[PDB]
Enzyme design. Structure first.
Site, PDB file in Angstrom:
ATOM      1  CE  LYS A  82      24.058 -32.125 -59.284  1.00  0.00           C
ATOM      2  NZ  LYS A  82      23.130 -31.893 -58.134  1.00  0.00           N
TER       3      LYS A  82
ATOM      4  CD  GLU B  26      25.677 -43.141 -57.954  1.00  0.00           C
ATOM      5  OE1 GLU B  26      25.143 -42.104 -58.401  1.00  0.00           O
ATOM      6  OE2 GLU B  26      25.951 -44.127 -58.666  1.00  0.00           O
ATOM      7  NE  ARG B  27      19.579 -40.826 -53.378  1.00  0.00           N
ATOM      8  CZ  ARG B  27      19.582 -39.611 -53.922  1.00  0.00           C
ATOM      9  NH1 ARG B  27      19.804 -39.452 -55.213  1.00  0.00           N
ATOM     10  NH2 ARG B  27      19.364 -38.542 -53.169  1.00  0.00           N
TER      11      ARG B  27
HETATM   12  N1  LIG Z   1      12.369 -33.952 -67.115  1.00  0.00           N
HETATM   13  C1  LIG Z   1      11.944 -34.237 -65.863  1.00  0.00           C
HETATM   14  N2  LIG Z   1      10.628 -34.293 -65.577  1.00  0.00           N
HETATM   15  C2  LIG Z   1      10.184 -34.575 -64.338  1.00  0.00           C
HETATM   16  N3  LIG Z   1      11.003 -34.821 -63.296  1.00  0.00           N
HETATM   17  C3  LIG Z   1      12.348 -34.795 -63.443  1.00  0.00           C
HETATM   18  C4  LIG Z   1      12.903 -34.494 -64.768  1.00  0.00           C
HETATM   19  N4  LIG Z   1      14.238 -34.532 -64.642  1.00  0.00           N
HETATM   20  C5  LIG Z   1      14.525 -34.832 -63.350  1.00  0.00           C
HETATM   21  N5  LIG Z   1      13.391 -34.986 -62.631  1.00  0.00           N
HETATM   22  C6  LIG Z   1      13.315 -35.321 -61.184  1.00  0.00           C
HETATM   23  O1  LIG Z   1      14.487 -34.884 -60.494  1.00  0.00           O
HETATM   24  C7  LIG Z   1      14.989 -35.910 -59.633  1.00  0.00           C
HETATM   25  C8  LIG Z   1      16.512 -35.948 -59.730  1.00  0.00           C
HETATM   26  O2  LIG Z   1      17.146 -36.320 -58.502  1.00  0.00           O
HETATM   27  P1  LIG Z   1      18.749 -36.504 -58.506  1.00  0.00           P
HETATM   28  O3  LIG Z   1      19.255 -35.896 -59.783  1.00  0.00           O
HETATM   29  O4  LIG Z   1      19.109 -37.928 -58.195  1.00  0.00           O
HETATM   30  O5  LIG Z   1      19.198 -35.576 -57.277  1.00  0.00           O
HETATM   31  P2  LIG Z   1      20.590 -35.774 -56.488  1.00  0.00           P
HETATM   32  O6  LIG Z   1      21.551 -36.360 -57.497  1.00  0.00           O
HETATM   33  O7  LIG Z   1      20.937 -34.366 -56.042  1.00  0.00           O
HETATM   34  O8  LIG Z   1      20.236 -36.735 -55.373  1.00  0.00           O
HETATM   35  C9  LIG Z   1      14.317 -37.208 -60.051  1.00  0.00           C
HETATM   36  O9  LIG Z   1      13.739 -37.877 -58.934  1.00  0.00           O
HETATM   37  C10 LIG Z   1      13.241 -36.828 -61.043  1.00  0.00           C
HETATM   38  O10 LIG Z   1      11.960 -37.231 -60.569  1.00  0.00           O
HETATM   39 MG   LIG Z   2      21.890 -38.247 -58.392  1.00  0.00          MG
END
Ligand SMILES: Nc1ncnc2c1ncn2[C@@H]1O[C@H](COP(=O)(O)OP(=O)(O)O)[C@@H](O)[C@H]1O
Ligand SMILES: [Mg+2]
Lengths: 75, 45, 464
Positions: free
Chosen positions: C159, C185-186
């Protein structure tokens, strides 16, 4: 005139447990208790006043709820 | 007339709610604040 | 004359008023808490009338310290947020209090957060495509300039990365004015965003409203309305075009459920509030591009337990023009941004809008990936070798197409160190047409991960 009559009419609190079950209790009195106030019971037990109704206060009991029973004073 | 007063005065009307409070003090206050002797007697009754 | 508190159950508070002075619904009331360092003025929002001059209210602040019998005064109006061109550049909360400058905005024009959606007669559908520079989005789920876009997914699948990436793709160059509603969100992400928008110098052109997780549900549900009010002010009065980011809108319905369980209303299905669809609709229909003006909205939708059938996502699906859907499985494959090509959808992916060359390629890619997803049940047991040649030739390039949909996003630079890539639409169409026709079937799959365009594909393949 009405205001003065109302004032004339208007002119350390302790409560009592009316109900107790499985880690929760209901307390009578305590009109001036704050929500989530840390109440204390005779048995050396504490409680959290979660719900404040029009007639009684709901308190989650912390610790040994075994020591609580109807008719106990709460302060 | 008393009904007109008790409806027009919402705070006095709420104070007049006394079934939870001690009825003796409520009667004393109502009598002191509130004429036709019989109408007030019915009101206290 | 004023009212009194008579019941308290969490953030929900019942107040009694004189016989004839009961407040209307959604009116704001003030009450005092005076214990100590916990002391504060509580804002309550009227949610119900219980009869006998008694009304039930939702507290926008934690009720801890509120004792019965305290007086409650009616403001006579709904919760009001500041609006105006001066709103831009600063951070606000749900009640219109500026966090960067406490006194800021007290003297601005104030609008009620509760408003009726625009008349049907003033609605018009949008069809202009928005080019984001992400291969999977621009190919299979073309966004709409002035429409409603959403990103679905479970926990820990992208996200935030993709949302700040889209901020870089649109807001970094959008000529208009942006609003960012952080709905549950956080907070750390909010601080990171407040810093980043200043580093990139975009802050001066965008407003931020935050309602992060720590806040009780009552304000956690009204934050969205608070920000939407500023967005629709910029829409209707200033006449500017607007970007309205919201993350995460599922937490709005979750706070609705929390407050519902306290209001006493019976539960629905798995445990959401009734009128779930009605609250979500009253929120979403206000976010629309009326005739002659536009408000582009990108929303994030959480999905608990990856249960895409949960009533809340299933409800919010109805209000969206573009729906990118993330998946756990694609994330495990190492694909990023991990979009599910077969579940995601866009309403403007039709030849009349995007053109025949785009549509034919998108549908051929979908066909290949669908055949692949149908053969998966055998692939998992007997491997690729059991398949007949018409299926094996297809699967070999299906894997490559799937992996090529990945992209090295700008936002990921802070984690992988690899720089970001933007690709134009025509180059993506060319690349996927070539792929479906097999002009790249001789390269290994690992060559396709996280490339970008075609020249970068060749450069990477040369190194292997
Ligand atoms: N292209 C990418 N390459 C490596 N890691 C990724 C990539 N896209 C997203 N991530 C990882 O996915 C995580 C996304 O967390 P987030 O979307 O905030 O989850 P939520 O919104 O459910 O809390 C990030 O910490 C990031 O490290
Ligand atoms: Mg997020």
């Amino acid at each position: 005139x009405x205001x003065x009559x109302x004032x004339x009419x208007x002119x350390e609190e302790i409560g009592t447990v009316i109900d107790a079950g499985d880690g929760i209790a209901h307390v009578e009195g305590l009109p001036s208790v704050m929500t989530q106030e840390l109440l204390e019971f005779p048995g050396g037990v504490l409680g959290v006043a979660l719900n404040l109704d029009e007639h009684s206060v709901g308190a989650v009991i912390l610790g040994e709820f075994e020591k609580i029973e109807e008719g106990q004073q709460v302060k | 007339r008393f009904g007109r007063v008790l409806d027009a005065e919402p705070r006095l009307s709420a104070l007049l709610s006394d079934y939870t409070t001690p009825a003796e003090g409520r009667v004393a206050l109502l009598d002191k604040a509130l004429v036709n002797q019989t109408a007030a007697a019915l009101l206290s009754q | 004359t004023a009212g009194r508190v008579v019941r308290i159950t969490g953030p929900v508070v019942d107040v009694e008023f004189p016989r004839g002075s009961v407040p209307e619904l959604f009116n704001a009331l003030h009450a005092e808490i005076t214990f100590g360092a916990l002391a504060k003025t509580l804002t309550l929002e009227v949610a119900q009338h219980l009869g006998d001059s008694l009304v039930r209210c939702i507290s926008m602040q934690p009720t801890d310290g509120l004792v019965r019998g305290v007086e409650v005064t009616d403001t006579g109006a709904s919760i009001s947020v500041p609006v105006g061109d001066g709103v831009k550049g600063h951070v606000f909360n749900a009640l219109g209090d500026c966090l960067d400058d406490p006194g800021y905005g007290k003297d601005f024009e104030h609008w009620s957060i509760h408003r009726k959606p625009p008349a049907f007669s003033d609605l018009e559908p949008r069809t202009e495509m928005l080019e984001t520079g992400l291969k999977v989005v621009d190919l299979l789920t073309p966004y709409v300039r002035g429409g409603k876009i959403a990103l679905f997914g479970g926990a820990g699948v992208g996200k935030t990365v993709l949302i700040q990436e889209m901020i870089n793709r649109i807001a970094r160059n959008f000529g208009g004015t942006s609003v960012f509603a952080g709905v549950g969100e956080r907070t750390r992400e909010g601080n990171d965003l407040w810093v980043e928008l200043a580093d990139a110098n975009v802050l001066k052109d965008t407003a931020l409203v935050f309602g992060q997780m720590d806040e009780p549900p009552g304000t956690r549900m009204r934050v969205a309305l608070s920000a939407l009010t500023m967005a629709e002010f910029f829409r209707d009065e200033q006449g500017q075009d607007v970007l309205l980011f919201i993350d995460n809108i599922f937490r709005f319905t979750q706070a609705g459920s929390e407050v519902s369980t306290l209001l006493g209303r019976m539960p629905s299905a798995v445990g959401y509030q009734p009128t779930l669809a009605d609250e979500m609709g009253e929120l979403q229909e206000r976010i629309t591009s009326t005739r002659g003006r536009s408000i582009t909205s990108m929303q994030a939708v959480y999905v608990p337990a990856d249960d895409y059938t949960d009533p809340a996502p299933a409800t919010t699906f109805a209000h969206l023009d573009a729906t990118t859907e993330l998946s756990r499985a694609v994330f495990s494959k190492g694909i990023f941004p991990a979009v599910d090509p077969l579940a995601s959808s866009s309403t403007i992916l039709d030849p009349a809008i995007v053109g025949d060359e785009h549509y034919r390629v998108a549908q051929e890619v979908i066909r290949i990936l669908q055949r692949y997803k149908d053969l998966q049940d055998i692939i998992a047991i007997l491997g690729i070798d059991e398949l007949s040649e018409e299926d094996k030739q297809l699967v070999n390039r299906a894997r490559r197409i799937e992996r090529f949909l990945s992209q090295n996003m700008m936002a990921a630079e802070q984690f992988t160190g690899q720089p970001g890539s933007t690709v134009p639409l025509k180059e993506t169409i060319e690349a996927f047409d070539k792929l479906t026709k097999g002009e790249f079937d001789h390269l290994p799959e690992q060559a396709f991960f996280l490339i970008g365009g075609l020249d970068d594909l060749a450069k990477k393949a040369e190194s292997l």
